[PDB]
Amino acid sequence: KPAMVEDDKTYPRLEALTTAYRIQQMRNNAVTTLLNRADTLKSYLGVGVPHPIESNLGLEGVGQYYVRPYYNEATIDVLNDLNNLTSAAKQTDIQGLIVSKINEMVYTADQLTGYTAALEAAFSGRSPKPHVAIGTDMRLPQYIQINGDDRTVGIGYDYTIARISDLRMKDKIVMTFILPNESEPHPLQHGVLGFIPEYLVDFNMIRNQRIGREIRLTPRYRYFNFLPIMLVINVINLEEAIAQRTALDVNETQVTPAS
Amino acid sequence: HEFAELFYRTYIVTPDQAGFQLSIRRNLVWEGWTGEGLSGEKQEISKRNILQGLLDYTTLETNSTELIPVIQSGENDEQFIDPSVLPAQTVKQGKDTFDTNFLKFSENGEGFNLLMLAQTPSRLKKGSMTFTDSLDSRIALKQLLISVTKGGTTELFALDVNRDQYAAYTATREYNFRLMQLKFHTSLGLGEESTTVAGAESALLKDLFDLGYRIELDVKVDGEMNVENGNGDTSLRALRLARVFDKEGKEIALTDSRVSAALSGLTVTGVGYSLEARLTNINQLEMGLLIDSDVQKQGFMIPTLPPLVIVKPAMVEDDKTYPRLEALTTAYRIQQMRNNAVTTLLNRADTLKSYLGVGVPHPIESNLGLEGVGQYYVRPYYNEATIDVLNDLNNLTSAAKQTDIQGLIVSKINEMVYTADQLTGYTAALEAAFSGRSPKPHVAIGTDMRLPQYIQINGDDRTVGIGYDYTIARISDLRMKDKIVMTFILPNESEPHPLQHGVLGFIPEYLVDFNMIRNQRIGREIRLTPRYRYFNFLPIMLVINVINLEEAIAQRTALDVNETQVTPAS
Amino acid sequence: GLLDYTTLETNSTELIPVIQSGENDEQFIDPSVLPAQTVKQGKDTFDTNFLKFSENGEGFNLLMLAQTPSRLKKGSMTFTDSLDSRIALKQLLISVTKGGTTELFALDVNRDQYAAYTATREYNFRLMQLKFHTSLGLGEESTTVAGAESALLKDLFDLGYRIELDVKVDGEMNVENGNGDTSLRALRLARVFDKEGKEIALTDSRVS
Amino acid sequence: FSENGEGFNLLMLAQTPSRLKKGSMTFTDSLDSRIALKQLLISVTKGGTTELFALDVNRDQYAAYTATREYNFRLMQLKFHTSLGLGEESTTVAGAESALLKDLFDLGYRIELDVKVDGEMNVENGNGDTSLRALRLARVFDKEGKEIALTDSRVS
């Protein structure tokens, strides 16, 4: 801005600066880290293959000292995997398919990772239950939230559901196990946010024979990942199944002689 | 009447203005400017709006502090690898364009100078390599390029190494004061789907991969760097095949005949590496992202309309030639408040077909030929859909058929409303433009006299959506027959605002009564001059068409079973 | 009127150009390019066309054209008839030529944000100005004469490419005299669009 | 007079050598409050001979730019609607009396041309446009301040 007249019209108040900072840092870097962690787990562990504890040196996370590595991927085809008998009950059936699949994924992960044993070993005098953290886009959660007659989103498992407007996580469901009640880094957590505060420094610069006031913020933050466990599932072709009705996969018993 | 005031809020104006003018400030983001060193380009470049940043991902991600190696022909062609193995890659930071390649390991050779090596065209004008360039606290490897060779065929693997056990430079307990070293010892695993660089699945390890096997490559690399003057050297110490695994993660001896035959001809060597460093200057010589604001202000003005009058002989009272005074008022109220509004709505529908295409969003300030100031707060969006209830409705019993059709149509409405909220970003616009509370997007449903009773009887799966409010508008006009029109409406505001769908430009007019001896006759007349117009702001709307409604009710359509290829026909 | 709309909505004061065929022919486009159409006001039917752009001075008098036979029988053009607060371009025409083939499009620029005569205070005190600069788009599945496709823009429309024409039009009008003028300053295509909303260069093989 | 295609960026056009040597100019390099037409260059042609008359049209009532009530908030417009004349003793190239208009000047006649020039200018990045829209001869004046008919034998 010009360094002879204050201008709150071209440059707004400090709030615009702070909110631009807040958006950039606290959303885009985190999304990059999460998706890159997904991709690197894909690259190293294959698909759906448990690994012996501390036998996968070459991928961060002190969590590998307590839990077997595990990454699995799944695909839901709502158009070809939904069951209807009446148009009035289609959304409940959609919820049924999605919740049943997520429950199956959670149970299989808990089965082959042995997370319960690690959890009970790490903390004594208490036996908490594994907590599922689920993130997704701005359209799906209300197809997870109950409507009339529906069952719990994961039986016996407590959960949290998050909202994000960014367009990578469109029709995406990402989940893992975390500890909600701890504020200091543990090997069991998914990751921690290393943070170093920045203070504002405002002063004049003479750049290429200039006269102008300059405002600078240098951020200091870094995202680290601990638990090498995560499940990535995507749902495709939803609105078509909602608008176009499918029904009644029928398997003939070939009593009409062909076998 | 309900309909006209539903989409067009009444805004009254005194007769002393020819129109109303709006002023809106926009806050926008953009990097680098013309100045006078080149005075580059006419009509300059484009500037982005910040609100688009909430939905996009390369809008804010900028890097200028990164110290990436840069090629200069005839200057540093010796420090880089031979480009005959891998062609140089192109990278962009700031506004410079240049080619890069992986730095190579040298054993007995001289160390390089990372600080100097990363001079980019932006720096050179700003000054070449002054004192106060100091490397950041952490410097780490990102990729390693090992050549797995099978029978003369070379495949390069850009193994992402930035994420691993130990790649962060560590301060030394002794020796000099700023000598940071690299002590790198681990095994890097090649997964069964670990792709070759530049796409393409690994075609060499397929033989082990088809059996589901994997190889363990241990890597022996050391290095050192000075964080004051940018000097340092790195050397590879050892690299060889260490272990081979099965699908169960059980050690398999290299002496087995099959794996040994599959491993015949395998030699692995390290080609080069790439190293990340950030130039933490305390004085700094970058221009960040410039932030400004611009103001676009619009002029809206309101004309008159053709007059209406009744004439009658000026000696008598009549209910024959003139019933009371109410006739003109009723005619005028029709004139104003129904046909013109409906015509405006339909013309907007046609216009949005003409411009936006079917069901495709556009970025912010993507078009200016569209009417309405609301175009700066949301992506434009127009989508249409039709439901063939005859070919789509589910029938179980003849008793619940109306409930079934109601559920189908309401589910379709929910789909469109939710996907509109997803694609437009209207929700965040409401969150921002008003800060006292976060109101739910208030939805209005306008349609003819036919449909509404098939929308609300009983058994609503979801009303119009959870936490959504609705208002049902009904009208008798024909050309709206058998359609559904919906949009987004603010019920709590009265003044012009970019989040209104429309505002009814209205100035009062009063009766004109006096004698005119014209055409050489005498009569009493009542001149009525209406002056109003409809002004609409928000460029978002959704429409739904229904066909075969009569066909489905009076003819059964059930169970389009989908036989799935069990009767042998493949 | 309760059911149909056309039983009402009468015009009797709007000023529309009228062909006298020999008395004001110079101020219309020639009939060899676009045949005149018949329109009705009140009980009077007549011919109308588009006012030619003033390529070289010679402004036009608006009241000299708006004598309908109903106004002819009403005697001389009344001296006190003044224009309304609003005067705007109701319809803009474009002619695209490729290889000698001429086609006309009807772009409805009515009610657009930058197409209303605004009061100007630099000259006199009853002068209205027009200042028209925007991008007039052409429908990918519409905009031929009232919609639908064309015979010269197939290559873009089949793949669905959208064209933006930048327009520079300036105009002035006097709401007491009836003298006014209108001129086209510049007219050409600048950008080409698609579904994705990202422009394509004018040098790509298909677009070129 | 640029009419079609690109306009002109004035800030590009004023890159004097000293400005090259000094580097770059400061932020928000803004134009003058007013913009003026310092000269209008018209050409007179009679039979194939062209003579240039440099009419300094500055300080006439309508050579000033004003802000628009639409578009951007920095766009200033130019509307120059007036009559320009060429006289016997007014400053002109090849003397106050030129060769192509000597006949009228000897008869004491001075010609008046109606000029209609309009334009656009922005004071933020230096881009703008101007177009010549109308220019012809309209009235002829004698040594006595009364308009003479164009159909009269001598003037015609």
Residue numbers in the entry:
A (entry chain B): 339 to 597
B (entry chain C): 28 to 597
C (entry chain F): 80 to 287
D (entry chain k): 132 to 287
What does the paper say about this structure?
This complex configuration involves fourteen putative tail fibers with depolymerase activity that provide ϕKp24 with the ability to infect a broad panel of capsular polysaccharide (CPS) types of Klebsiella pneumoniae. We determine the structure of the capsid and tail at 4.1 Å and 3.0 Å resolution.
The hexamers and pentamers of ϕKp24 are made up of copies of the same major capsid protein (MCP, gp372, accession number QQV92002). Gp372 contains 597 amino acids and is to our knowledge the largest MCP currently described in any phage. It consists of three major parts: a “triangular body” (gray triangle, dotted box, residues 28–88, 314–597); an “arm” (blue oval, blue, residues 89-166); and a “hand” (orange oval, orange, residues 167–313). Briefly, models of the hexamer and pentamer assemblies were first constructed via rigid docking of the predicted gp372 structure and subsequently refined to our 4.1 Å map using molecular dynamics flexible fitting (MDFF). The triangular body of the MCPs interacts primarily with the triangular bodies of the MCPs directly adjacent and within the same hexamer. These interactions include a series of complimentary salt bridges between residue R477 and E442 on the clockwise neighbor, as well as residue R583 and both D419 and D587 on the clockwise neighbor. In addition to these interactions formed between MCPs within the same hexamer, the hand region also mediates strong interactions with the hand region of an MCP from an adjacent hexamer. These involve a large cluster of charged residues, including E201, K210, K247, D249, E251, D260, and R264, which form complementary interactions. Finally, compared to other known phage capsid structures, the MCP of ϕKp24 displayed a structural feature that has, to our knowledge, not been previously reported: each of the six long C-terminal loops (residues Q582-S597) participate in the formation of a central helical pore with an outer diameter of ~2 nm.
